[PDB]
Amino acid sequence: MDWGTLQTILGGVNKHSTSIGKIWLTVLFIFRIMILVVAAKEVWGDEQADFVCNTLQPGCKNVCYDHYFPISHIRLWALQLIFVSTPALLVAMHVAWTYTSSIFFRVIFEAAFMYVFYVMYDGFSMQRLVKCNAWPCPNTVDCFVSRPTEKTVFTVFMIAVSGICILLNVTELSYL
Amino acid sequence: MDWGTLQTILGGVNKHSTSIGKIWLTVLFIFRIMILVVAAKEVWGDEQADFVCNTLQPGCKNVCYDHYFPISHIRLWALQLIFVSTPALLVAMHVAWTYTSSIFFRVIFEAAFMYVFYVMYDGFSMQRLVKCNAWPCPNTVDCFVSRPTEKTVFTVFMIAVSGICILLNVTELSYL
Amino acid sequence: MDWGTLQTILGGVNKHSTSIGKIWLTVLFIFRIMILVVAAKEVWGDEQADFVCNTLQPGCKNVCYDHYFPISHIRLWALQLIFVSTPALLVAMHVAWTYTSSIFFRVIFEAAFMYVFYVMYDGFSMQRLVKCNAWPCPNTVDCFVSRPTEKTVFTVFMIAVSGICILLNVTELSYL
Amino acid sequence: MDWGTLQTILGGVNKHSTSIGKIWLTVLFIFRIMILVVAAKEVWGDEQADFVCNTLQPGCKNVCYDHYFPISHIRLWALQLIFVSTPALLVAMHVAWTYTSSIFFRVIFEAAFMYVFYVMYDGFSMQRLVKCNAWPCPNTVDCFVSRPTEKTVFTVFMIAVSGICILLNVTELSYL
Amino acid sequence: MDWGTLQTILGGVNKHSTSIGKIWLTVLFIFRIMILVVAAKEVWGDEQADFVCNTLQPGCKNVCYDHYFPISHIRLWALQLIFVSTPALLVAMHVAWTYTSSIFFRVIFEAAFMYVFYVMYDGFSMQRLVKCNAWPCPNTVDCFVSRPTEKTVFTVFMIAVSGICILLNVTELSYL
Amino acid sequence: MDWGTLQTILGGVNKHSTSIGKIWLTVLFIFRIMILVVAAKEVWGDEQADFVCNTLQPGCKNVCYDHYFPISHIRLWALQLIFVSTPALLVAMHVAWTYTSSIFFRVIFEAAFMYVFYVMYDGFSMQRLVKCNAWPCPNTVDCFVSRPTEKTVFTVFMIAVSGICILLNVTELSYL
């Protein structure tokens, strides 16, 4: 891939005691894109052949995999970014009803993804072994995970990023 | 990949009490492209090695796989987009027989994909286990699925998107 | 991949009661490229590990695979496109012996691929089970297929596309 | 990929009773590039997991694979093209010691690849089963191939292309 | 991929007895990008199917893999680069609070990645066999590695690069 | 990929009885890039699943693989090119301490890679079977290779290329 190949005329800088946010926020935008693609198919890209189930039950790997991973972290992120992406191309150029409502959209989205995330991954963690007692899964069986530490780390990162994103997003939203 | 690298001169905005749709609709277009590619080969990209059949019948996985998945969701989407894509490059620039018939085409296509979809995936769902009683499949056998929840989610999304696409598509088609 | 990243100066449109074809035909060209790459290695890309032969004969999968699939559909297509591709870059710009003979080439190629296709895939179909009685294949054995429905669908599409390609190709070839 | 995205100013055409070759030859160049990439990793791209050896000898697949396929067809082609590629960018623009020697280089290379090819693939063919009696391969064993017909076809094509390449290459080399 | 396709107007060179660093540092930047992508998914890209565990314990490969590889080297690098990347696009053009603090950021990051690295890979090495005594891993079991020498080599390289990066980074930071 | 898409203004040619080298050397540069990428992940790209070890020792494939292949040929090449790459972008434009020292760097690097190579692959060859007597590898075991002939061929090529690279590199370095 390659994303962004024309940014040369940016001599105009800020002078006020504000609009520091847009710097921080474009930086976090670009950042999160890199951070994503660089580790995109490269942490969670694997986790299909990595959910070993101690059994001889047919299918129970698939069963428990959806049971505990309806969706992977990186998708909720990918979405979180895209919904939080549309205000970016908006704020690309501003001076001359929406504009600040773009800022607010950007806030509330990111908030939503945080909440529903912690609803799903309660404990902000990756259990080393998830058991499973699904229908075909004849009793409570065991179902492993690879690299739970890893995924936990990058999750801590992205959530911290979400917090700072919103804090400057809102710190300039709160101009009154 | 990278799609779209020249859009700078768009200072001209709308002033009437209409043409809000074209904003919404170009946004939904770009959106659905991202939404697609980001999760393109990344939800349904897997589902070949993910249709476990409890048996010892040769081939019965392939048999039942085509039996229940003639085609995957994402293809019907891919098509739905492309047939609904041609009016986009048309409406790229408009002011000066087709033009509104492009709008109507865009409506009726998306409608068609909705209908035939629900004909095929009746119940707007992903069954956790599809049985199968095909010729080689000696009796009614079991044939699993992975991530049925996941696919169900993104299907709910794309169908909602279809509804809103058409509603603004038609809301401006209905100018009289 | 990415194909085509410079098309901006196309303000000049047609005014006659003809040259509608070139619109349709460039559209079908671009279309078929997308249609291809999007589903390229994604329907027939699999079909090597998908030709289960009920036997214990060594090699009989390979034997019968070539026996019934000398070549896959998508190759005959790929070729069909490429031979039908050279007139495209020709007709890129036209006004000022070949020019109409390019049109005729484009016709007759596509016709040829249709005929030889139906010679090979007689019945415009994908049999769910092909038997096989090759030399090593000790008796008439069974040899399965995956997703025969799928491949049948996309074949119906590409052949319909061929028909319309030629019909406008020739409708403007028939100017007299 | 994408190769070639700037060719617009070519209004100047030929008027003599020659230089038809450069048309044919640039066309064959572009052609062979397409023809290659389209079927590049798509006929011979597979043939690693496709050389079944009826045995229980360890390694004998690798052994016999190198034994009968030191190198695949498509590499000899890839090279054949590249060595025959350098005169192309040379002849990109010509009018104002090398120039005709570029033409001759282009001839003799393509000739060489033809000869050494037929030295290696004697019979211009793909045997359905190659036996093998290598050291570890304990007796004469059997070692299969997939799609030998296919590869034979595309080989017939590329060799015919080589013949016509040289014939026009030389027909204009023979100007005296 | 392709990164960087517009750098032509650089006739202005340095004349002082300093700013040699920016040459060295842009070179190391570009370098490390190449060095990365060229060997990116090509040394550590494999190491999922390469951690053989002498056992019959289910999952113990995944268990011990995360146990000893929470994260691979190349990720810590990828990050190290990206955090050390933002000052680069800053120092792209300079003459006319941040500017030198960008230099200092660039220092301290790279330092941090060095330290935490050696915390994790103590001994600046790749053990040929890591044992493992995890919960499911019933006793102390054995768990192999592939190419430990290789990875050790490229690690020695990247750490040396870090040292020189910082030494010139700081040698020009230390201007007083 | 695609590398190099702007080279049009090169009407200025050489007239002296020298600077033939820069032609040869840019050609060899471009060449080696093509030669690489075309066969890059396509000869040595495989050799992970291709090192069959006649045993029942766990891990002994990995063990002996690193034992005999610390690093693959194509990496030593990749490096050899990159270290020999920096003088290229330097010599892109020259007329108006480094310049000739770039030439000398280019020499001595390529020399180094030759020497250390032959230190490692002594005999300029690919043994059809490497035995192995590592710790876990319980006795002297056997460990196979695929396509040793192939790799030998392309190695002969790249080393010859190195020789000619240096000979013209130095023939113009030796101007006095």
Residue-by-residue DSSP string for D138-173 = -SSEEEE-S-HHHHHHHHHHHHHHHHHHHHHHHHHH
Is residue C56 in a domain? Answer: yes
Q: How far apart are CA B53 and CA C145, in angstroms?
A: 16
Q: How far apart are CA D141 and CA D59, in angstroms?
A: 12
Q: How far apart are CA C88 and CA C78, in angstroms?
A: 15
CA distances (Å), origin B96, targets B93, B99: 9, 11
Task: Evaluate whether A116 touches A77 at the Cβ level (below 8 Å).
Answer: no
Is residue C1 in a domain? Answer: no
Two structure tokens written together for A109: 């989205």
Two structure tokens written together for B158: 């794309």
Q: Residue E97's CB: how many other CB atoms inside 10 A?
A: 4
Residue D118: CA count within 13 A, CB half-sphere? 10
Nearest to F84, CA basis, from F106, F117, F102: F106
* CB-neighbour burial class of residue F132 (10 A; exposed 0-12, middle 13-18, buried 19+): buried
Is residue F9 in a domain? Answer: no
Is residue E122 in a domain? Answer: yes
Chain-chain contact of D128 with C66 (C-beta, under 8 angstroms): yes
Strand D141-144 versus strand D129-132 pairing type:
antiparallel
Is residue F8 in a domain? Answer: no
After which residues does chain C break, using C–N > 2.5 Å?
96
**Count of structural domains within chain F:** 1
Q: How far apart are CA C43 and CA C154, in angstroms?
A: 9
The residue type at B23: I
Query: Does F2 lie at the interface with E, CB-CB under 8 angstroms?
Result: yes
Contacts of C153 in chain B (CB under 8 A): 70-71
Two structure tokens written together for E129: 């066999």
Reduced to 3 states (helix: H, G, I; strand: E, B; else coil), residue C131 is strand
Reduced to 3 states (helix: H, G, I; strand: E, B; else coil), residue C80 is helix
Which residues, in sequence order, are bridge partners of residue D131?
Answer: D142
Task: Evaluate whether D65 touches D51 at the Cβ level (below 8 Å).
Answer: yes
How many residues are recorded in chain B? 176
Contacts of A66 in chain B (CB under 8 A): 128, 146-150
Give me the residues of C, 27-56, that contact B with CB < 8 A. Answer: 27, 31, 34-35, 38-39, 46, 50, 52-54
Q: How far apart are CA D49 and CA F46, in angstroms?
A: 11
Experimental method: cryo-EM
Is residue C172 in a domain? Answer: yes
Can you say whether the dihedral through the CA atoms of B100, B106, B108, B109 is positive or negative? positive
Residues 6+ apart with CB under 8 A from C88: C25, C26, C29
Chain-chain contact of B62 with C147 (C-beta, under 8 angstroms): yes
Neighbours of chain B (3+ CB pairs under 8 A): A, C
Task: Determine which of F1, F51, F66 to mutate to test the interface with E (most E C-beta atoms within 10 Å).
Answer: F66
How many residues are recorded in chain E? 176
Nearest to F48, CA basis, from B46, E153, E44: E44
Q: Transcribe A64-96 into DSSP letters.
A: HHHHH-SS-HHHHHHHHHHHTTHHHHHHTS---
The separation between the first and the last C-alpha atoms of chain B, rounded to the nearest angstrom, is: 41
Q: Note down the domain range covering F53.
A: 17-176
Task: Evaluate whether E102 touches E87 at the Cβ level (below 8 Å).
Answer: yes
Is residue B2 in a domain? Answer: no
CA distances (Å), origin A17, targets C35, E99, F104: 53, 19, 54
Chain-chain contact of F50 with D58 (C-beta, under 8 angstroms): no
CB nearest to A71's CB, from B27, B53, B150: B150
Contacts of C54 in chain B (CB under 8 A): 58-59, 136
Edge-to-edge order in the sheet of strand C53-54: C53-54, C141-144, C129-132
| Residue E175 per-residue DSSP state | T
Can you say whether the dihedral through the CA atoms of E95, E99, E104, E110 is positive or negative? negative
Task: Evaluate whether F168 touches D85 at the Cβ level (below 8 Å).
Answer: no
Q: How far apart are CA D84 and CA D78, in angstroms?
A: 10
**C104: enclosing H helix or E strand:** helix C99-120
Supply the Cα-derived Rg of chain E in whole angstroms: 20
Nearest to E128, CA basis, from E49, E50, E45: E50
Q: Residue F125's CB: how many other CB atoms inside 10 A?
A: 13
Two structure tokens written together for D101: 């020697």
Q: How far apart are CA F94 and CA F96, in angstroms?
A: 7
- Residue with token string 């050609």: F27
Q: How far apart are CA C63 and CA C133, in angstroms?
A: 10
What are the E-state strand segments in chain B?
A: 53-54, 129-132, 141-144
Q: Transcribe C40-51 into DSSP letters.
A: GGGTTTSTTS--
Q: How far apart are CA A140 and CA A138, in angstroms?
A: 7
**Residue B47 among known ligand-binding residues:** yes
Q: How far apart are CA F149 and CA F167, in angstroms?
A: 27
Reduced to 3 states (helix: H, G, I; strand: E, B; else coil), residue D123 is coil
Q: How far apart are CA F101 and CA D175, in angstroms?
A: 47
Contacts of C2 in chain D (CB under 8 A): 2
Strand A129-132 versus strand A141-144 pairing type:
antiparallel
| Residue B170 per-residue DSSP state | H
Q: Residue C11's CB: how many other CB atoms inside 10 A?
A: 6
Supply the Cα-derived Rg of chain B in whole angstroms: 20
- Residue with token string 């995360």: E66
**A144: enclosing H helix or E strand:** strand A141-144
Is residue D4 in a domain? Answer: no
Task: Evaluate whether A7 touches A93 at the Cβ level (below 8 Å).
Answer: no
Strand F141-144 versus strand B53-54 pairing type:
unpaired
Contacts of B78 in chain C (CB under 8 A): 38-39
Query: Does E60 lie at the interface with F, CB-CB under 8 angstroms?
Result: no
* Per-residue three-class SS string for B51-90: CCEECCCCCHHHHHHHHHCCCCHHHHHHHHHHHCCHHHHH
Q: How far apart are CA A24 and CA A172, in angstroms?
A: 11
Q: How far apart are CA A77 and CA A117, in angstroms?
A: 10
Two structure tokens written together for B112: 């068609």
Can you say whether the dihedral through the CA atoms of F1, F5, F11, F16 is positive or negative? negative
Ramachandran bin of A73, using left for φ above 0, alpha for ψ from -120 to 50, beta for the remaining angles: alpha
Supply the Cα-derived Rg of chain C in whole angstroms: 20
Two structure tokens written together for C14: 């047609």
**Residue B45 among known ligand-binding residues:** yes
Q: How far apart are CA C36 and CA C82, in angstroms?
A: 12
Q: Report residue B107 CA to chain centroid gap.
A: 14
CA distances (Å), origin D69, targets B50, D62, D135, D169, F156: 34, 10, 17, 31, 18
Edge-to-edge order in the sheet of strand A141-144: A53-54, A141-144, A129-132
Residues 6+ apart with CB under 8 A from D112: none
Contacts of B66 in chain C (CB under 8 A): 128, 146-150
Q: How far is B21 from chain C (nearest CA, A)?
A: 24
Chain-chain contact of D70 with F150 (C-beta, under 8 angstroms): yes
Supply the Cα-derived Rg of chain F in whole angstroms: 20
Q: How far apart are CA C104 and CA C82, in angstroms?
A: 15
* Per-residue three-class SS string for chain F: CCCCCCCCCCCCCCCCCCCHHHHHHHHHHHHHHHHHHHCHHHCCCCCCCCCCEECCCCCHHHHHHHHHCCCCHHHHHHHHHHHCCHHHHHHCCCCCCCHHHHHHHHHHHHHHHHHHHHHHCCCCCCCCEEEECCCCCCCCEEEECCCHHHHHHHHHHHHHHHHHHHHHHHHHHCCC
Residue F129's φ and ψ, nearest 5 degrees, are -140, 120
| Residue B131 per-residue DSSP state | E
Q: How far apart are CA B65 and CA C50, in angstroms?
A: 11
Two structure tokens written together for B146: 């992975």
Nearest to C153, CA basis, from F15, F7, B76, B26: B76
Chain-chain contact of C1 with B6 (C-beta, under 8 angstroms): no
Nearest to D53, CA basis, from F52, C29, F40, E78: F52
| Residue D13 per-residue DSSP state | -
Neighbours of chain F (3+ CB pairs under 8 A): D, E
Nearest to D126, CA basis, from C66, C65, C119: C66
Task: Evaluate whether A58 touches A136 at the Cβ level (below 8 Å).
Answer: yes
